[PDB]
Amino acid sequence: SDISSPLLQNTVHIDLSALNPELVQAVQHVVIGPSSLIVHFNEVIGRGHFGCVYHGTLLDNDGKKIHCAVKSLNRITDIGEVSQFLTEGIIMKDFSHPNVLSLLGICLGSPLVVLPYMKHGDLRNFIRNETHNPTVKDLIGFGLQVAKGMKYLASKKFVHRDLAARNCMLDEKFTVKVADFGLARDMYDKEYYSVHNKTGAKLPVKWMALESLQTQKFTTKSDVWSFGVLLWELMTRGAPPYPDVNTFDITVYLLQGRRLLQPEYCPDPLYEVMLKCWHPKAEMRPSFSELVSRISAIFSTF
Ligand SMILES: Cn1cc2cc(C(F)(F)c3nnc4ccc(-c5cnn(C6CC6)c5)nn34)c(F)cc2n1
């Protein structure tokens, strides 16, 4: 009734006055009460170009304290670009898959992206840790899990656009979740991104398909490309792709027909899968449901 004590569902109207009405109801379904979440600003567990990520404490229908990471959007200053960002990714609320990063809620100067806590961090930093010992079968299992969640996202006609081993997280059961999409989309390691200078688009050149560099029209076939590079990172346990090829001549490398070489510890049937995902004709690349068929057969056998 008042300016000072409005109901929670109305605080979407108040603190997000630049939002679509369609989107007002969308983020009205996913509001988090401030008295139900404590944000630890004492330590940052993640930094992105829109803001930092903090450890949080979400309180549910019972007092149960579920750990979380809470993504801050403080650095995006324009309260109309914020509204655009919520327009891009609120569709995450409809997604539910064991291999996909879910969204717990949006709290409320910018809003707060409340996401499940990932005990083991991102997929790349895990496979690169000296003190970690994943076998060959393990890393293929990781590439199996991302293929499933990708197959789920592909079924929603959803183009993630930035599939890479730095953008998939690991919970405490080592379930891989595709992340870095929607409200979680950001640049969590700036080194690999080119900002286009007409479109503001952010480009992960080492992971983008060849048609994506020529046109900037991302598709479901272009994530298949990014998935085989993801296979490549796993088999090299997180090595940078194309260390002898800087971003500029990357197109010259791929227009010649040259791809990433077979790693020392990648089975030939798995490296053959990589080459099919990098086919110059996008419509002839394997689907994510065909990928899950091939990788499972490779993951079981030796
Ligand atoms: C302990 N924990 C931290 C979390 C961060 C997020 C996140 F930030 F929101 C997020 N969503 N998708 C992604 C994809 C990649 C990264 C990411 C972060 N760091 N890195 C390494 C430097 C490159 C990649 N984060 N991320 C999350 F949802 C849950 C989390 N749990």
Swiss-Prot record:
Interaction with RANBP9: region residues: 170-302
Positions of the UniProt region annotated as Interaction with MUC20: 278-302
Residues that bear Phosphotyrosine: Y188, Y192, Y193
Outcome reported for the amino acid change (mutating V178I): In RCCP; germline mutation
Disease affiliated with this protein: Activation of MET after rearrangement with the TPR gene produces an oncogenic protein.
The record's note on its domains: The kinase domain is involved in SPSB1 binding.
Tissue expression pattern: Expressed in normal hepatocytes as well as in epithelial cells lining the stomach, the small and the large intestine. Found also in basal keratinocytes of esophagus and skin. High levels are found in liver, gastrointestinal tract, thyroid and kidney. Also present in the brain. Expressed in metaphyseal bone (at protein level).
UniProt modification remark: Dephosphorylated by PTPN1 and PTPN2. Ubiquitinated. Ubiquitination by CBL regulates MET endocytosis, resulting in decreasing plasma membrane receptor abundance, and in endosomal degradation and/or recycling of internalized receptors.
Family the entry assigns: Belongs to the protein kinase superfamily. Tyr protein kinase family.
Mutagenesis or variant effect for M92T: In RCCP; germline mutation
Locations listed in the record: Membrane
Subunit structure: Heterodimer made of an alpha chain (50 kDa) and a beta chain (145 kDa) which are disulfide linked. Binds PLXNB1. Interacts when phosphorylated with downstream effectors including STAT3, PIK3R1, SRC, PCLG1, GRB2 and GAB1. Interacts with SPSB1, SPSB2 and SPSB4. Interacts with INPP5D/SHIP1. Interacts with RANBP9 and RANBP10, as well as SPSB1, SPSB2, SPSB3 and SPSB4. SPSB1 binding occurs in the presence and in the absence of HGF, however HGF treatment has a positive effect on this interaction. (Microbial infection) Interacts via extracytoplasmic residues 25-656 with L.monocytogenes InlB; MET can bind HGF, its endogenous ligand, and InlB simultaneously. InlB probably dimerizes upon binding to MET, which encourages subsequent dimerization of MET.
All residue ranges annotated as the Protein kinase domain in the record: 39-302
Effect recorded for Y188H: In RCCP; somatic mutation
Effect in UniProt of substituting D186H: In RCCP; somatic mutation
Effect seen on changing V146L: In RCCP; germline mutation
Described purpose of this protein according to its UniProt entry: Receptor tyrosine kinase that transduces signals from the extracellular matrix into the cytoplasm by binding to hepatocyte growth factor/HGF ligand. Regulates many physiological processes including proliferation, scattering, morphogenesis and survival. Ligand binding at the cell surface induces autophosphorylation of MET on its intracellular domain that provides docking sites for downstream signaling molecules. Following activation by ligand, interacts with the PI3-kinase subunit PIK3R1, PLCG1, SRC, GRB2, STAT3 or the adapter GAB1. (Microbial infection) Acts as a receptor for Listeria monocytogenes internalin InlB, mediating entry of the pathogen into cells.
Outcome after substituting Y271F: No effect on ligand-induced CBL-mediated ubiquitination
Cytoplasmic side: 1-302
Residues binding ATP, per UniProt: I45, G46, R47, G48, H49, F50, G51, C52, V53, K71
Protein name per Swiss-Prot or TrEMBL: Hepatocyte growth factor receptor
Substitution effect: Y192F: Complete loss of kinase activity and of ligand-induced ubiquitination. Alters interaction with PTPN1 and PTPN2. Loss of interaction with PTPN1 and PTPN2
Gene name for this UniProt entry: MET
Positions annotated as active site in the UniProt record: D162
Domain of life: Eukaryota
Modified residues (Phosphothreonine): T247
